[PDB]
């Protein structure tokens, strides 16, 4: 049974775009722009795109297309590095454990939006505290006693019923049902592979853009939207002197493009050999970043409208993360005429943003492990059910009363330093141990031209240096786990560190296992470990390029 190919090129392109574009593009990037010099922030962000993210996008796409393997089994080219693929698969599973809970929040809000009186508009509900204040009468983004903030935290999260990560409580049945719907949708999107996932991304990857267009058209007309847009784009070039601006740009690029997460390789593994993955990488990464920039306009139109409504400044309402889309934006919707339609479309947009990223993350695991074990390849529906059901069970923790604390711990540690280290290790493998020249020969075989000197230099020095820089800052910028005013106990930090290390130790562990399992002398074992599995007959002939300086000096 040969590997199938995408039904269309558009299927592959929309899968890549839907994975790359998600809630991050919307609820993180515009805030980073606003707080890091506005238009000035685009300089570090675009720079890092061009020199690290587009190169990594291109490398992962070409690797997947050429080898037609998942993240794990692609390391037939460099056997010692298969622990890196195992680590990225584990990280993708970890991420899915909490990403689907955010998707379930979006689904909960969408269900709540099917009314003419949105539950977050007013007080007087069962979840409202006695201190709830009508927002018309009312820093602000964290007031916590508005109907929207109270609705979120007390009728969606029920966070008031949990003291901390030590008292997370039981899963909440409403969020449990929303999670069940999310996982059922994911299963029936993924159980038949790309033949159906590529058609599902036609909806999931494109609907967000229609919603964004209508949201932009309406928001630009809102009172005070121009002030919010000016705050969004106001250029402060002196912010570029600060290291934090560049750190934020690098982290945003790395995490928003999703290169090296095992998803793009899995998607490209279903490409036809002659597909132009260079142009695909350029187009898809550009689409991701431009989507972020465009969505910032709608976000800050609504933020300026809210600031004008409350007679406050933009900094008093500017927020990021769940706070923005689940407290600030719903209140603005409730203020707008036709608030029901706006809420419905906004939360359908959130669902569409999240669902295809979850699809990509789960396909990373499915493809990577099915390529590794042929039994899983033979049983796609059963293995997909196993993956989705395990994700549901281990996301049950994040829908508990204190599930927000578990989700904070996971969001911090599942795919932070661990994913950065894994991507650094795989970039190093590909561009140094396997060889950037070998990779260029592979791309020439696929596409008829070798990648230019710029891309090779990026792969060998700039992308590795960028990844090492982000790893180093992530380690340096470790702030003990906290959520709002809550400070996690030390054991919670230990658990998060264990989660981060669980995937990171797979790399040295797999290298040790490969060395010990291989037969021969020390140098024979090393040569087998660093030699492509289809060239292992050459080792007996003592013909190893990695043992020559020319291989390492290849630029």
């Amino acid at each position, epitope marked *: 049974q040969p590997r199938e190919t995408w039904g269309k090129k558009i299927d592959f392109l929309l899968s890549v775009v839907g994975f790359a574009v998600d809630l991050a593009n919307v609820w993180r990037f515009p805030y980073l722009c606003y707080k890091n010099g506005g238009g000035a922030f685009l300089i570090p962000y675009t720079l890092f795109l061009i020199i690290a993210g587009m190169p990594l996008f291109y490398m992962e796409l070409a690797l997947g297309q050429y080898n037609r393997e998942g993240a794990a089994t692609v390391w037939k080219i460099c056997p010692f590095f298969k622990g890196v693929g195992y680590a990225v698969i584990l990280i993708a599973l970890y991420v899915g454990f909490y990403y689907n809970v955010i998707i379930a929040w979006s689904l909960y809000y969408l269900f709540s939006s099917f009314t003419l009186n949105l539950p977050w508009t007013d007080c007087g509900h069962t979840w409202n505290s006695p201190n709830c204040t009508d927002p018309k009468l009312l820093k602000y983004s964290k007031y916590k006693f508005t109907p929207a903030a109270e609705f979120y935290e007390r009728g969606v999260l029920h966070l008031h019923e949990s003291s901390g990560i030590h008292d997370i409580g039981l899963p909440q049945w409403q969020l449990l049902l929303c999670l069940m719907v999310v996982v059922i949708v994911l299963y029936f999107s993924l159980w038949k592979g790309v033949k159906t996932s590529g058609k599902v991304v036609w909806i999931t990857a494109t609907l967000p853009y229609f919603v964004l267009f209508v949201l932009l058209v309406h928001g630009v007309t809102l009172p005070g939207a121009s002030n919010g847009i000016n705050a969004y784009l106001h250029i402060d070039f002196y912010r570029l002197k600060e290291a934090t601006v560049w750190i934020d740009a690098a982290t945003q690029i790395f995490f928003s493009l999703g290169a090296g997460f095992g998803v793009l390789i899995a998607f490209a593994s279903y490409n*036809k050999f002659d597909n132009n993955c260079y142009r695909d990488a350029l187009l898809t990464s550009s689409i991701n970043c431009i989507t972020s920039f465009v969505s910032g306009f709608a976000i800050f139109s609504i933020l300026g409208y809210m600031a004008h409504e409350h007679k406050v400044n933009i900094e008093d309402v500017a927020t990021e993360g769940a706070g923005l889309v689940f407290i600030l934006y719903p209140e603005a919707i409730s203020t707008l005429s036709g608030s029901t339609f706006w809420a419905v479309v906004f939360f359908v947009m959130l669902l569409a943003l999240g669902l295809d990223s979850s699809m990509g993350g789960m396909e990373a695991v499915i493809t990577g492990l099915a390529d590794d074990f042929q039994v899983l390849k033979r049983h796609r529906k059963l293995f997909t059910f196993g993956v989705t059901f395990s994700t549901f069970l281990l996301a049950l923790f994040c829908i508990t009363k204190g599930g927000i604390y578990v989700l904070t711990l996971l969001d911090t540690f599942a795919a932070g330093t661990s994913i950065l280290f894994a991507v650094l290790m795989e970039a190093i493998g590909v561009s140094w141990f396997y060889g950037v020249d070998r990779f260029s020969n592979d791309i020439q075989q696929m596409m008829g031209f070798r990648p230019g000197l710029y891309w090779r230099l990026c792969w060998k020095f700039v992308s590795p240096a960028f990844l090492l820089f982000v790893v180093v800052v992530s380690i340096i910028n470790f702030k003990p786990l906290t959520y709002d005013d809550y400070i996690f106990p030390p054991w919670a930090n230990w658990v998060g560190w264990g989660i981060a290390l669980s995937s990171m130790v797979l790399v040295p562990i797999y290298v040790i296992y490969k060395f010990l399992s291989t037969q021969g002398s020390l140098w024979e074992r090393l040569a087998y470990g660093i030699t492509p599995e289809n060239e292992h007959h050459l080792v007996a002939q003592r013909d190893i390029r990695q043992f020559q300086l020319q291989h390492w000096l290849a630029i």
Partner: nanobody
Amino acid sequence: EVQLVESGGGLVQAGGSLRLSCAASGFPVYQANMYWYRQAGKEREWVAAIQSEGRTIYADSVKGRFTISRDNSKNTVYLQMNSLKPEDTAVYYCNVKDAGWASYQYDYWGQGTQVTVSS
């Protein structure tokens, strides 16, 4: 069943020409990624490819000398090799990578045809 039948190989005099054929069955070559490889105590090295859209690409060592073509009616891919060198001596393998989009990645290889160039 997908089958690639290599033919046309044989002994050539340095500077001579040879037309290798690859009769393909089970798929249409006019939409497939058809690749030619060769394996001289050396690894299998890509030689030329005629791709699903008809684009012909060649390895550097053979570029300008070899010409890859395909006959849609005969479902055959031709590697027309001119100006053959003693370094071209090898077993030439016709390979189908896939039949384009909405197809399968049958990375199927023919048994290969030996080409010998005598100085």
